[PDB]
Write an enzyme that holds these catalytic residues in place. Structure first.
Site, PDB file in Angstrom:
ATOM      1  N   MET A  23       6.507   0.622  -2.783  1.00  0.00           N
ATOM      2  CA  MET A  23       7.425  -0.308  -3.341  1.00  0.00           C
ATOM      3  C   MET A  23       8.705  -0.258  -2.639  1.00  0.00           C
ATOM      4  O   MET A  23       9.132   0.680  -2.943  1.00  0.00           O
ATOM      5  CB  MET A  23       7.232  -0.427  -4.732  1.00  0.00           C
ATOM      6  CG  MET A  23       7.888  -1.699  -5.243  1.00  0.00           C
ATOM      7  SD  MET A  23       7.825  -1.961  -6.957  1.00  0.00           S
ATOM      8  CE  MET A  23       6.212  -2.520  -7.210  1.00  0.00           C
ATOM      9  N   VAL A  24       9.121  -1.653  -1.954  1.00  0.00           N
ATOM     10  CA  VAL A  24      10.554  -1.393  -1.721  1.00  0.00           C
ATOM     11  C   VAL A  24      11.215  -2.340  -2.587  1.00  0.00           C
ATOM     12  O   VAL A  24      10.931  -3.511  -2.959  1.00  0.00           O
ATOM     13  CB  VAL A  24      10.443  -2.033  -0.155  1.00  0.00           C
ATOM     14  CG1 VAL A  24      11.987  -2.263   0.183  1.00  0.00           C
ATOM     15  CG2 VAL A  24       9.744  -1.241   0.680  1.00  0.00           C
ATOM     16  N   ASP A  43       3.845   2.405  16.786  1.00  0.00           N
ATOM     17  CA  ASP A  43       3.476   1.237  15.886  1.00  0.00           C
ATOM     18  C   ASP A  43       4.745   0.125  15.672  1.00  0.00           C
ATOM     19  O   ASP A  43       4.795  -0.410  14.660  1.00  0.00           O
ATOM     20  CB  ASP A  43       3.120   1.755  14.639  1.00  0.00           C
ATOM     21  CG  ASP A  43       2.318   0.592  13.762  1.00  0.00           C
ATOM     22  OD1 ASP A  43       1.604  -0.466  14.025  1.00  0.00           O
ATOM     23  OD2 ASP A  43       2.397   0.861  12.295  1.00  0.00           O
ATOM     24  N   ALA A  53       0.891  -1.268   0.003  1.00  0.00           N
ATOM     25  CA  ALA A  53       0.122   0.086   0.054  1.00  0.00           C
ATOM     26  C   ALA A  53       1.001   1.275   0.026  1.00  0.00           C
ATOM     27  O   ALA A  53       0.977   2.061  -0.882  1.00  0.00           O
ATOM     28  CB  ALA A  53      -0.979  -0.041   1.281  1.00  0.00           C
ATOM     29  N   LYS A  78      12.727   3.044  -0.983  1.00  0.00           N
ATOM     30  CA  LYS A  78      11.225   2.766  -1.156  1.00  0.00           C
ATOM     31  C   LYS A  78      10.574   3.882  -1.973  1.00  0.00           C
ATOM     32  O   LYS A  78      10.863   5.061  -1.883  1.00  0.00           O
ATOM     33  CB  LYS A  78      10.635   2.833   0.077  1.00  0.00           C
ATOM     34  CG  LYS A  78       9.043   2.943   0.250  1.00  0.00           C
ATOM     35  CD  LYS A  78       8.556   2.909   1.533  1.00  0.00           C
ATOM     36  CE  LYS A  78       9.027   4.215   2.281  1.00  0.00           C
ATOM     37  NZ  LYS A  78       7.955   4.233   3.658  1.00  0.00           N
TER      38      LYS A  78
HETATM   39  N1  LIG Z   1      16.564  -0.835   5.392  1.00  0.00           N
HETATM   40  C1  LIG Z   1      15.954  -2.065   4.908  1.00  0.00           C
HETATM   41  N2  LIG Z   1      16.394  -2.929   4.174  1.00  0.00           N
HETATM   42  N3  LIG Z   1      15.453  -3.971   3.684  1.00  0.00           N
HETATM   43  C2  LIG Z   1      14.095  -3.440   3.996  1.00  0.00           C
HETATM   44  N4  LIG Z   1      12.908  -3.601   4.066  1.00  0.00           N
HETATM   45  N5  LIG Z   1      11.765  -2.878   4.468  1.00  0.00           N
HETATM   46  C3  LIG Z   1      11.925  -1.629   5.182  1.00  0.00           C
HETATM   47  C4  LIG Z   1      10.702  -0.704   5.487  1.00  0.00           C
HETATM   48  C5  LIG Z   1      10.574   0.563   4.674  1.00  0.00           C
HETATM   49  C6  LIG Z   1      11.455   1.599   3.855  1.00  0.00           C
HETATM   50  C7  LIG Z   1      12.494   1.000   2.835  1.00  0.00           C
HETATM   51  C8  LIG Z   1      13.523   1.445   1.929  1.00  0.00           C
HETATM   52  C9  LIG Z   1      13.397   2.967   2.291  1.00  0.00           C
HETATM   53  C10 LIG Z   1      12.763   3.630   3.137  1.00  0.00           C
HETATM   54  C11 LIG Z   1      11.870   2.807   4.058  1.00  0.00           C
HETATM   55  N6  LIG Z   1       9.622   1.308   5.142  1.00  0.00           N
HETATM   56  N7  LIG Z   1       9.056   0.499   6.119  1.00  0.00           N
HETATM   57  C12 LIG Z   1       7.554   0.779   6.636  1.00  0.00           C
HETATM   58  C13 LIG Z   1       6.985  -0.514   7.424  1.00  0.00           C
HETATM   59  C14 LIG Z   1       7.663  -1.657   7.605  1.00  0.00           C
HETATM   60  C15 LIG Z   1       9.052  -1.811   7.102  1.00  0.00           C
HETATM   61  C16 LIG Z   1       9.605  -0.849   6.158  1.00  0.00           C
HETATM   62  C17 LIG Z   1      13.339  -1.313   5.332  1.00  0.00           C
HETATM   63  C18 LIG Z   1      14.541  -2.168   4.639  1.00  0.00           C
END
Ligand SMILES: Nc1n[nH]c2nnc(-c3c(-c4ccccc4)nn4ccccc34)cc12
Length: 350
Positions: free
Chosen positions: A31-32, A142, A28, A47
């Site tokens: 996209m990561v 959260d 939502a 992201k």
């Molecule tokens: N630093 C990370 N390496 N792999 C990941 N997978 N999900 C996350 C991640 C990010 C995100 C991703 C890239 C840039 C900014 C925010 N926002 N986010 C929000 C809720 C739960 C996990 C998560 C972070 C990482």
């Protein structure tokens, strides 16, 4: 002689600094993906988010970015870079960059069984970072398994400050059954009773839920809907004592609890047979019904279970408290876009 590059869902405009993109997730709010960071030769996580269409989406983005950029701590993920158009008018999507972390607690608990060594260590790192955030008068609100990033070398870092905000204890009281947005399974009992989650005690409750979940690879109180979450909590904790009725002034909350049959507390050791007793004692203090009696972060770090890591002088606090002059609701999507623009200006060449 190259291209903009697309993952699965859509395009990712982050060249030329980052390349070799690989899809990671998407839930939502963006996209990561995993890209290769030229210059500083290391892989990174990036992201893509297109929040400007929605008001809600714009708040989440501002909190995350403003907070993350301001914080500087080993157990909190930092923002390395932020990509976006040169002007407000041309800005439709923002890209945030962070060091690459192989997995997160949620993904790791799906298959791996953490040992006591690793539990104790991960709890410590969680609390070390929480001490820093709370010391800046901020509440994450959260904290859950998917919000905790993990390196292969076990370094744990907190990351989703979308719903985070400045403490503010004076305005925590609300009516019985007041709507809430943070993840259900990790909401403290008072959220459904008479609280808005404007005090530090709310993060501690979530942390305890994460302790329990690490101890048995599954959510301690997996509620299906709003009031079921409190039924799950009360099921294990027993009926709240009468002797101490700190808070709980509104008659609707008190009367609801007062209309439930007496239910005895399910002993921790019974739910977690083979588990260190010290861990269980902390768990107890973190998951105490009454938010005023609930243990606070520094106090938690000083608990015997964490004695192998405890060291106050090596548990930094924020240099200065956080100030959020944006107000909860009140603030159109337009100005939010401007603040986001301003907040991210430092990463533009100049
Ligand atoms: N630093 C990370 N390496 N792999 C990941 N997978 N999900 C996350 C991640 C990010 C995100 C991703 C890239 C840039 C900014 C925010 N926002 N986010 C929000 C809720 C739960 C996990 C998560 C972070 C990482």
């Amino acid at each position: 002689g190259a291209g903009p590059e697309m993952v699965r869902g859509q395009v990712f405009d982050v060249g030329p600094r980052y390349t070799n993109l690989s899809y990671i997730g998407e839930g939502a709010y963006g996209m990561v993906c995993s890209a290769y960071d030229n210059v500083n030769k290391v892989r990174v996580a990036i992201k893509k988010i297109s929040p400007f269409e929605h008001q809600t989406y714009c708040q989440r983005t501002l909190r995350e970015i403003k907070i993350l950029l301001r914080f500087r701590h080993e157990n909190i993920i930092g923002i390395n870079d932020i990509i976006r158009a040169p002007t407000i008018e041309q800005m439709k999507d923002v890209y945030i960059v962070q060091d690459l972390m192989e997995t997160d607690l949620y993904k790791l608990l799906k298959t791996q069984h953490l040992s006591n060594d690793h539990i104790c260590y991960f709890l410590y790192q969680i609390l070390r970072g929480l001490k820093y955030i709370h010391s800046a008068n901020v509440l994450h609100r959260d904290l859950k398994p998917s919000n905790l990033l993990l390196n292969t070398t076990c370094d744990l870092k907190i990351c989703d400050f979308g719903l985070a905000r400045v403490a503010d204890p004076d305005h925590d009281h609300t009516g019985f059954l007041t709507e809430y947005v943070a993840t259900r399974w990790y909401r403290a009992p008072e959220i459904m009773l008479n609280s808005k989650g404007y005090t530090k005690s709310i993060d501690i409750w979530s942390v305890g839920c994460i302790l329990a979940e690490m101890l048995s690879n599954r959510p301690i109180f997996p509620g299906k809907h709003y009031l079921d979450q409190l039924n799950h909590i009360l099921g294990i904790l027993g009926s709240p004592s009468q002797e101490d009725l700190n808070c709980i002034i509104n008659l609707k909350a008190r009367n609801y609890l007062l209309s439930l049959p007496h239910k005895n507390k399910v002993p921790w050791n019974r739910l977690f047979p083979n588990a260190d007793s010290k861990a269980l004692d902390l768990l107890d203090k973190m998951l105490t019904f009454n938010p005023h009696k609930r243990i606070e972060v520094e106090q938690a770090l000083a608990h015997p279970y964490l004695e192998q890591y405890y060291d106050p002088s090596d548990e930094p606090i924020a240099e200065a408290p956080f100030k959020f002059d944006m107000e909860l609701d009140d603030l159109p999507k337009e100005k939010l876009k401007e603040l986001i623009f301003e907040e991210t200006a430092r990463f533009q060449p100049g």
